[PDB]
Amino acid sequence: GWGPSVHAEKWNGRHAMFGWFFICCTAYAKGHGLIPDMDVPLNLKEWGTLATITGKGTITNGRAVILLANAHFFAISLMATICPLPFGDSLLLLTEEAEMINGRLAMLGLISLIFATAIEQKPMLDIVNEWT
Amino acid sequence: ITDNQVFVALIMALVCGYLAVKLAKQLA
Amino acid sequence: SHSVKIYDTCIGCTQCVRACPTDVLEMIPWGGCKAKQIASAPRTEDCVGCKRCESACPTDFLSVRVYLWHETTRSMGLAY
Amino acid sequence: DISGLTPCKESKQFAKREKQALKKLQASLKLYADDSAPALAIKATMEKTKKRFDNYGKYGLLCGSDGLPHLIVSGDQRHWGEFITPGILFLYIAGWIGWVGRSYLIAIRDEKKPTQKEIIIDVPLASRLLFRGFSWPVAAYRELLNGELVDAAAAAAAAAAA
Amino acid sequence: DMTWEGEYPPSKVLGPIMSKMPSGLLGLISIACAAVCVYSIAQSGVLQQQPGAYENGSWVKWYYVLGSFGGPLAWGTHVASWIQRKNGM
Amino acid sequence: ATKFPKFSQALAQDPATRRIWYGIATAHDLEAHDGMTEENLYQKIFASHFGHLAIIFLWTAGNLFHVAWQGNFEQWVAKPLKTKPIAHSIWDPHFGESALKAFSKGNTYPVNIAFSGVYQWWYTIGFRTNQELYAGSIGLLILSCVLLFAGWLHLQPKFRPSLSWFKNNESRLNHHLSGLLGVSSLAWTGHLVHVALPASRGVHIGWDNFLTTPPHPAGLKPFFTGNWTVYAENPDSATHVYGTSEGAGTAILTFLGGFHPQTQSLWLSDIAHHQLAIAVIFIVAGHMYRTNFGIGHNMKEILDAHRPPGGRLGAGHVGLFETITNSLHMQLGLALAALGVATSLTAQHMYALTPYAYLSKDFTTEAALYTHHQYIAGFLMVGAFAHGAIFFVRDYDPELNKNNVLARMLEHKEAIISHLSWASLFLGFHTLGLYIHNDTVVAFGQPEKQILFEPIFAEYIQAASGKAVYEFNVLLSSSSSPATVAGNQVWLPGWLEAINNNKNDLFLKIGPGDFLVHHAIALGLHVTALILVKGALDARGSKLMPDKKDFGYSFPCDGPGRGGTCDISAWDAFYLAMFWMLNTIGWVTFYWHWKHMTIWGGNPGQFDESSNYIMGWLRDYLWLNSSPLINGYNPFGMNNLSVWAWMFLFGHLIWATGFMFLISWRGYWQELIETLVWAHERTPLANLIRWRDKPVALSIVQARLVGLVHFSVGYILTYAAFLIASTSGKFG
Amino acid sequence: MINLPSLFVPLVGLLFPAVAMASLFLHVEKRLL
Amino acid sequence: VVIFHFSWKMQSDVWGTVTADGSISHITGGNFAQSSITINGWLRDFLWSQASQVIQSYGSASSAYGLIFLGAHF
Amino acid sequence: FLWISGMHFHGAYFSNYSAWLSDPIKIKQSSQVVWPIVGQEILNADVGGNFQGVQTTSGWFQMWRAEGITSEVE
Ligand code: CLA
Ligand code: CLA
Ligand code: CLA
Ligand SMILES: CCCCCCCCCCCCCCCC(=O)OC[C@H](COP(=O)(O)OC[C@@H](O)CO)OC(=O)CCCCCCCCCCCCCCC
Ligand SMILES: CC(=O)O[C@H]1CC(C)(C)C(=C=C/C(C)=C/C=C/C(C)=C/C=C/C=C(C)/C=C/C=C(\C)C(=O)C[C@@]23O[C@]2(C)C[C@@H](O)CC3(C)C)[C@](C)(O)C1
Ligand code: KC1
Ligand SMILES: CC1=C(C#C/C(C)=C/C=C/C(C)=C/C=C/C=C(C)/C=C/C=C(C)/C=C/[C@@]23O[C@]2(C)C[C@@H](O)CC3(C)C)C(C)(C)C[C@H](O)C1
Ligand SMILES: CC1=C(/C=C/C(C)=C/C=C/C(C)=C/C=C/C=C(C)/C=C/C=C(C)/C=C/C2=C(C)CCCC2(C)C)C(C)(C)CCC1
Ligand SMILES: CCCCCCCCCCCCO[C@@H]1O[C@H](CO)[C@@H](O[C@H]2O[C@H](CO)[C@@H](O)[C@H](O)[C@H]2O)[C@H](O)[C@H]1O
Ligand code: SF4
């Protein structure tokens, strides 16, 4: 693959579709959801200069939980490239087309999300709120 | 002082980085 | 490999051939000097480039001449 | 005067240097008894020091704001003793050596073993030659307008280039 | 073609206009140019000295500047005249 | 070739690690690539020039972006005397808590203080807000995209220009003088008149009102009528708050001379007029050569006609036209020599005649700027002679310049070298002997016995320019002289005021300490030249190697025969000269810095007395000024200057590792690696892994280049460390 | 934004060189090219 | 490094004078445990601090050591 | 032997051995004296015992005391 191949259209479609579920889950959760101690930083005394924005200003618990939740889904995939199954899909070499038209559409919304944020001074969860 | 100004500046740097990778391809 | 050239001022006194540590030069029949023999470089691919041949040549300037060339495993002098 | 310098006999800072140099040796002198060898040595040192300041005061040298003597080498004839007169002196002795040494090499050149006489000097011959360089400006001039000073261009070996 | 040998260079080095011209005219022109340059410089100096004429760079005049520029012209013309004389012209 | 070096079939078939090292280091030597033709050569270089031009504008666009985004430009413009300017912010996960508090003293976050002087520069050209700085950075990012597109566009086959276009000297020169230098100078004068001057007077002119606001009340009527005197009328008053309209003039083209009384910098209207007068000279000068219009000169016809009839210069300049056009190394060598003189000239004129508002106030930047252009001037100069040698080896044609002015230089090469050697020996013996005499004399307690020559010549020059402190009454410093009577009206009074003011840089007070250092600087220049000129003239051959041109520019040696021949190549002369450049710039930078530290400290006499002997330099300059640097960090704690202290030690280490590559040679190392290759092949579980390139020791010429880079990078980083923190740690 | 340096500096300092050193290694050791 | 180690350890932790009640005052005052663990500490407390004698020896009887100091750097 | 014979000779004619033997806590050691010719006498330090010389650090004095020297004649 490695470019505008059919495979790379199929893999990135699977990430878009999975991504919409991750954005809508937070949209439900940052938008009146059970996130605890959402906007208060971590501790410089406990985490260090890795956790800081500038000076000692530390990332909030909201940003940390979302980043670490992304690393949960990242690391289990990173396994699937390095040690793939003998029967699974290979990188870097209701059953069909349904991926290819949803995964096209799912890649079409995210770019049209980023249009609708750079214009209206609105973060990406408000536009998902307007779309319900 | 605006966040949107910073975003515009690195889209043009991304277009610039693409013309550089393309310029080197041809020098080789 | 390296390049070893032999000029006509060669008086044929066999001293380069006796100094070569990797058997690159030899003496051949020639009818242009008193000794009727000239040096020749038939196996320049064994040439390591140490220039012992030029340290032995009595003419001024030298009759034998070594020029640096692309290096193989043989001219690098490797035992591995 | 030249460069806003003052003469050393009229410099307030040159006089302070003279006093402090003597005071330093007097405070060292007080720790010894008067007839002993360290007291006679430091007393002789303060005489040498005091004569060093007196000499400069009348010398005609120039001092700065630092209080130290300065030397003028523009070519003024009024400050000749500073560079010209010791300059002409050095030229006489340096050109004397170079001339005499060259006479030696040229003399022992026409010989079986010239190299033998450079490690082992023919002293009777060398001694004779050494004192013939007292009139070198005349001897170096006779050979320039003879042809025996400089060789021709077809006698010097030259690098392949030129 | 430009390279020359001997005591003096060929007439062609001067240029198309100069080579055609006689030595005498060139010499006279060079003298005139020299006179113009010196006079202009002197006048400019006088203006600089003068009260009420030197304020805000009023002393500078276009013609005097032209004469000053003309000094170099006077040198070249005299050299050209010498070359012309050498080429029997 | 099918290996990593695709341009050298002979380097791509090497089984050792040397192949990797050489493909990197010969990548730009375009003439030596496999199957290189002349037309393809000029095209590759041309497109390489575009990509180089874009990196410069991308670099500039960076510096504009970081200050606009993280600097204190707006706060600096308001109070340029108290606030420290901000390079960029720091984000390093390796910092302790006390590090974040040490680098954020006086601010909100971790930050680097700038010593580039871009602040003072941008201030005087008009900039006042962060929005303007940001807009300027976007315009340089767009310009870099255009240059990267042009480089590609000129490699296309229909846009690749022919060999005869690259050799059209008469056109290129015409366009570069009148267009690249003249019109740019003209355009720069337009910026000063419309934006720069108005901003210094409290008037804001931007892209929204420059078309409806004239820069002068008269408004171009005086220009077309020949009334040019109106642009000099009513200049800034003596007491004019800079940046405000309080005491503002209206004049746009003056000739005041000296400095603005408030910023201690040059008058903006003096700079505008200077750029305009220069613009007229370069535009006129660009009409000298004939380019398909009939009128003009032929360069070849000029050069062939210049042979003095006395015969002293031989055949004159016949053949030089062909040798310059048919060789890029001679062109490159002439271009590097003029830039090295130019960037050295900018280092001397900037510290003496400070052009930017508030320059020579931020003591550290002045010290950073002067030593930055002097070290770069040294590399350029050494690179000029290095390419001069390359020309003789593979470009000089002896039959083409028979009896030429160039050929005659080789015909008495032994004279030049032997005489350059005499001057060097003379300066070395006496300058070193005088310093040592002063050292022993002071060591013995008799400093009144020192030999201190007064620098009469330099002082005379100063007196002729107007300096009335040496009581010479020569020229501009004597009132009844035609030089000063003509000069009083136009610009003399501003110059005399500035030249006689002590708190300046215009002709510093020089003494016998200024005399000894100059002869050391002389010695440095002569020895460096000796090595570079000897390397260029003996590049084609010598007594020890009469066929040197057959081996090229760079090669190891000629073996241990006929005595031994280490460092015989012309490349080796360059390598040996590098040490001298670093050494003679180091004597210049120590001298310039020490002389200022004592003027700023308020005790100029300290340098006037201790600079006579060496111990003075070692104790009152080096040992006495290293205190705040090496206290950057200690057991008690660390400060803002900890990085300079860490960099100071860093430099000493790289310099010292450079000694390893320069003293210990190759066949020691080759034998060592053979035991390592053996060990790796005999150890179980490490045997499964194996190199694809036989490990070998670096070659003879590679060790010299590496040892040189360490000695160089260590040399420059440890002085940068010293000069910046000794000035910023004392601020005076 | 003000959140940008904690995103780029690991990417530029650790990620970009690890990809670039990997890419050059593959190119330098590739036989027919 | 051996003689540097010996010259500094003896001056920091042995050599010195005393007064009443055994009050030991060392030569460099016990700076050896917290100043020799870094290169900067070796450069600033051993080489820079203890240089003050040889560089300020002019006009005194130990001024030959100041000249031989420079002579050996040369 | 010539080297050793010199040292003992310097300790007998150009030293302050006797004054050192009487009070070896205050008198500094010295076995070398320089001639005064170009201002170099400053190297004769004020050592003690009505003596001026260069301080020597070879330990000749201490070695002589341990042998039970006590006199220049010896
Ligand atoms: C920010 C970066 C990022 C993120 C968020 C993701 C996200 C994802 N990648 Mg990934 N990927 C990335 C970068 C990223 N990728 C990069 C750079 C690469 C290298 C090119 C890859 C290469 C890659 C590959 C090759 C694969 C992924 C896959 C996946 C998916 C895994 C989701 C999953 O399995 O759960 C959702 C799916 C399920 C089936 C859920 C199963 C539920 C289990 C059983 C847990 C439920 C238990 C419950 C919680 C109770 C706990 C029980 C306990 C108490 C006992 C998801 C789409 C994989 C994929 O799409 O297949 C799934 C896959 O094969 N990725
Ligand atoms: C008016 C038309 C014009 C203009 C503006 C340019 C402009 C340029 N050409 Mg160009 N060119 C032209 C016509 C023109 N050309 C024509 C017609 C030809 C064909 C015959 C060429 C052929 C050509 C080639 C073959 C190349 C260029 C290159 C360049 C670039 C030079 C590098 C640079 O940025 O320097 C900018 C420099 C300055 C702004 C000036 C710097 C200041 C210097 C140092 C002057 C010193 C000041 C002063 C005099 C000092 C004196 C003081 C004294 C006491 C020492 C530049 C963009 C080169 C390039 O990079 O290609 C992309 C290149 O290789 N040109
Ligand atoms: C406009 C200026 C200019 C141009 C066009 C050239 C162009 C050229 N030069 Mg040249 N040169 C220049 C300036 C210039 N040079 C200067 C200023 C000097 C003086 C230093 C030299 C000295 C010089 C020599 C001695 C030689 C050349 C050679 C060459 C040719 C091949 C270069 C090559 O293969 O590089 C390959 C590129 C490299 C090897 C990269 C080297 C990177 C260096 C080592 C610095 C890296 C250290 C790094 C910055 C340290 C980081 C520190 C950090 C840890 C803190 C090429 C024609 C060579 C040749 O073969 O000509 C026939 C040759 O022998 N030049
Ligand atoms: C000095 C180093 C500078 C850097 C090097 C740059 C090159 C500079 C060298 C070029 C000029 C060479 C000039 C000498 C070589 C030389 O000039 O010979 C040649 C030169 C002119 O000869 P030409 O070859 O041009 O022949 C013309 C004749 O044949 C007439 O047709 O002679 C001159 O008269 C020059 C002009 C006046 C010369 C003398 C007058 C100057 C007075 C100076 C005072 C002397 C001191 C006296 C003390 C008591
Ligand atoms: C009919 C006939 O036969 O006539 C006869 C007459 C006569 C007299 C017998 C003959 C003769 C001999 C002649 C004609 C001799 C002539 C000699 C002559 C005319 C010699 C000029 C030199 C000019 C120089 C050096 C200019 C320097 C100019 C310089 C150095 C400048 O920089 C000028 C300038 O700096 C200023 C000052 C300032 C600026 O504002 C402008 C610039 C910067 C550019 C002839 C040849 O036989 C012909
Ligand atoms: C969130 C989870 C989600 C799931 C789980 C899901 C599942 C399937 N979609 Mg789907 N989907 C959306 C989301 C999801 N879809 C959204 C937001 C849209 C509007 C943009 C939508 C668009 C379309 C269109 C246009 C088609 C389509 C189909 C199928 C199909 C089985 C095909 C088969 O095998 O027969 C399956 C299983 C095709 C179809 O129904 O064919 C008879 C077909 O044309 N979808
Ligand atoms: C062809 C054509 C034309 C056209 C066209 C068109 C329409 C081109 C369109 C191209 C288009 C539409 C390209 C989008 C890519 C979007 C991607 C790759 C999304 C990635 C998103 C991914 C991989 C998911 C990331 C995340 O999961 C992560 C990693 C973690 C989560 O926390 C967050 C989310 C879930 C986000 C023209 C212009 C008309 C010309 C001609 O006429 C015909
Ligand atoms: C080797 C080689 C080369 C190189 C060279 C070089 C590198 C050189 C350099 C050179 C140089 C680097 C030079 C410099 C010079 C300078 C000068 C020559 C100056 C001048 C000056 C003057 C003359 C004057 C001035 C003045 C004025 C103007 C006025 C005021 C005052 C005065 C007087 C000061 C080449 C390339 C050719 C090639 C071949 C080989
Ligand atoms: C190699 C990769 C390097 C590239 C990294 C570049 C990162 C690009 C970041 C783009 C940001 C897109 O994400 C979206 O941006 C918009 C831009 O206002 C934000 O919109 C923002 O509006 C205002 C700013 O005016 C903020 O005060 C508000 O908090 C926020 O909502 C959204 O909250 C954010 O979700
Ligand atoms: S090349 Fe030299 S050594 Fe060999 S035969 Fe000729 S003279 Fe003898």
- What one-character-per-residue DSSP string does F71-100 give? S-HHHHHH-TTTSPPEEEE---TT--HHHH
Residue I54: beta bridge partners?
I32
Q: How was this structure determined?
A: cryo-EM
Chain A residue at shortest CA distance from G3: A53
Sequence-ordered list of residues with C-beta below 8 angstroms from that of D65, at least 6 positions apart, any chain: D13, F605
Resolution in A, one decimal?
2.4
Contact: A55, F110; criterion CB under 8 Å? yes
The alpha carbon of A4 and the centre of ligand 7 are apart by a number of angstroms equal to 12
* Residue F115 CB-density burial (10 A; 0-12 exposed, 13-18 middle, 19+ buried): buried
What ranges do the domains of chain D cover? 1-162
Q: Among F583, F573, F718, which Cα is nearest to F655's?
A: F718
Q: For chains F and C, tell me whether 3 or more CB atom pairs sit within 8 A of each other.
A: yes
DSSP F505: -
* Residue F505 CB-density burial (10 A; 0-12 exposed, 13-18 middle, 19+ buried): middle
Q: For chains E and H, tell me whether 3 or more CB atom pairs sit within 8 A of each other.
A: no
Q: Among F246, F232, F235, which Cα is nearest to F203's?
A: F246
Phi-psi label, residue I70: left if phi above 0, alpha if psi -120 to 50, beta otherwise: left
Please check whether residue H30 touches F, CB under 8 A: no
Which tokens is D122 given? 């023919």
Phi-psi label, residue H30: left if phi above 0, alpha if psi -120 to 50, beta otherwise: left
**C-alpha span between A107 and A14 (Å, rounded):** 9
DSSP F202: T
Q: Among A128, C56, E64, G15, which Cα is nearest to F561's?
A: C56
Strands H24-26 and H16-18 come out as antiparallel
Ligand 1, atom 22: closest residue by C-alpha: A77
Q: Are A1 and A8 in contact (CB under 8 A)?
A: yes
- What one-character-per-residue DSSP string does H9-72 give? HHHHHT-EEE-GGG-EEESS-STTTTTSSSHHHIIIIIIITTTHHHHT-TTSTTHHHHHHHHHH
Q: Using most ligand atoms within 8 A of CB, pick from G3, G6, G8 the residue to mutate for ligand 9.
A: G8
Which tokens is F240 given? 């004019």
With beta carbons under 8 A apart, name residues in chain I contacting D28.
Answer: 46
Strands A57-58 and H24-26 come out as unpaired
Min Cα–Cα distance to chain E from F445, Å: 58
Ligand 4, atom 26: closest residue by C-alpha: F310
Which tokens is A113 given? 């999300």
Residue I32: beta bridge partners?
I54
Q: Among F248, F254, F249, F250, which Cα is nearest to F276's?
A: F254
Helix (H) or strand (E) holding F339: helix F328-352
Q: Are I32 and I58 in contact (CB under 8 A)?
A: no
DSSP H helices, chain B, are 3-27
Using DSSP, state whether A49 is helix, strand or coil. Answer: coil
- Residue B7: CB atoms within 10 Å: 12
Estimate to the nearest angstrom the gap between the alpha carbon of F467 and the chain centroid. Answer: 30
The alpha carbon of F29 and the centre of ligand 3 are apart by a number of angstroms equal to 9
Q: Are I30 and I3 in contact (CB under 8 A)?
A: no
**C-alpha span between A106 and A128 (Å, rounded):** 14
Residue E31 Cβ < 6 Å to ligand 5: yes
- What one-character-per-residue DSSP string does F101-170 give? HHTTTTSSS-EEEP-S-HHHHHHHTT--SHHHHHHHHHHHHHHHHHHHHHHHHTTSTTTPPPHHHHT-HH
Q: Are F86 and F112 in contact (CB under 8 A)?
A: yes
What's the order of all strands across the beta sheet hosting I45-46? Answer: I30-32, I52-55, I45-46
Residue C6: beta bridge partners?
C64
| Cα separation of the two ends of chain D | 54
Q: Using most ligand atoms within 8 A of CB, pick from F328, F329, F332, F334 the residue to mutate for ligand 8.
A: F334
**C-alpha span between F410 and F396 (Å, rounded):** 11
Helix (H) or strand (E) holding E27: helix E23-49
Q: Which atom of ligand 4 is nearest to the CA of F311?
A: 24
* B10-19 CB contacts, 8 Å cutoff, 24+ apart: B12/F138, B12/F141, B12/F142, B12/F145, B13/F141, B15/F145, B16/F54, B16/F58, B16/F141, B16/F144, B16/F145, B16/F148, B19/F145, B19/F148, B19/F149, B19/F152
Q: Are F673 and F697 in contact (CB under 8 A)?
A: yes
Using DSSP, state whether F13 is helix, strand or coil. Answer: coil
Q: Amino acid identity of D142?
A: R
Could you give the C-alpha distances from H35 to F385, F624, F631, H30, H43, in angstroms and in order?
48, 21, 12, 10, 10
Strands D69-70 and A52-54 come out as unpaired
- Residue F197: CB atoms within 10 Å: 27
Strands F86-89 and D69-70 come out as unpaired
**C-alpha span between F32 and F8 (Å, rounded):** 9
For D62, phi and psi rounded to 5 degrees?
A: -110, 135
Q: Are F657 and F642 in contact (CB under 8 A)?
A: no
Strands D62-63 and I45-46 come out as unpaired
Estimate to the nearest angstrom the gap between the alpha carbon of D97 and the chain centroid. Answer: 14
Q: Among F89, F92, F100, F90, which Cα is nearest to F67's?
A: F89
Taking CB atoms and an 8 Å cut-off, how many pairs form between chains A and G? 7
Angle at F475 between CA F470 and CA F478, to 5 degrees: 70
Length of chain C in residues, anyone? Answer: 80
Chains within contact range of chain A (3+ C-beta pairs < 8 Å): F, G
The alpha carbon of C39 and the centre of ligand 10 are apart by a number of angstroms equal to 6
Sequence-ordered list of residues with C-beta below 8 angstroms from that of C46, at least 6 positions apart, any chain: C22, C23, C24, C74
For C27, phi and psi rounded to 5 degrees?
A: -105, 135
The sign of the torsion formed by the CA atoms of D14, D15, D18, D24 equals negative
Angle at F409 between CA F405 and CA F413, to 5 degrees: 170
Chains within contact range of chain E (3+ C-beta pairs < 8 Å): F
Residue F16: beta bridge partners?
F694
Residue A124 Cβ < 6 Å to ligand 9: yes
**C-alpha span between H10 and C52 (Å, rounded):** 57
Residue A14 Cβ < 6 Å to ligand 7: no
Ligand 7, atom 5: closest residue by C-alpha: A108
HSE of D54, CA atoms in CB hemisphere, 13 A: 7
Residues of D with CB under 8 A from a CB of I: 28, 31-33, 36-38, 41, 44-45
Sequence-ordered list of residues with C-beta below 8 angstroms from that of F677, at least 6 positions apart, any chain: C80, F694, F695
Which tokens is F449 given? 């016995």
Residues H28, H31, H35, H39, Cα dihedral to 10° = 30
Helix (H) or strand (E) holding E63: helix E62-86
DSSP I35: -
Q: Among D21, D99, A71, D161, which Cα is nearest to F417's?
A: D161
Residue I45: beta bridge partners?
I53
- What one-character-per-residue DSSP string does D123-139 give? HHHHHHHHTTGGGHHHH
Q: Are F48 and B27 in contact (CB under 8 A)?
A: yes
Q: Are H56 and H71 in contact (CB under 8 A)?
A: no
For F154, phi and psi rounded to 5 degrees?
A: -90, 10
Min Cα–Cα distance to chain I from F444, Å: 6
Q: Are D72 and F456 in contact (CB under 8 A)?
A: yes
Q: Among I11, I4, I51, which Cα is nearest to I28's?
A: I51
Q: Among F389, F327, F383, which Cα is nearest to F537's?
A: F389
Q: For chains F and I, tell me whether 3 or more CB atom pairs sit within 8 A of each other.
A: yes
Query: In F, residues 193-232, which contact E (CB 8 Å cutoff)?
Result: 226, 228-229, 232
**C-alpha span between E79 and E72 (Å, rounded):** 11
- Judge if the upstream peptide bond of residue A18 is cis by omega within 30 degrees of 0: no
Using DSSP, state whether F173 is helix, strand or coil. Answer: helix
Residue E40 Cβ < 6 Å to ligand 5: no
**C-alpha span between F649 and H43 (Å, rounded):** 9
Could you give the C-alpha distances from E6 to E79, F69, F243, F306, F402, in angstroms and in order?
17, 71, 67, 13, 18
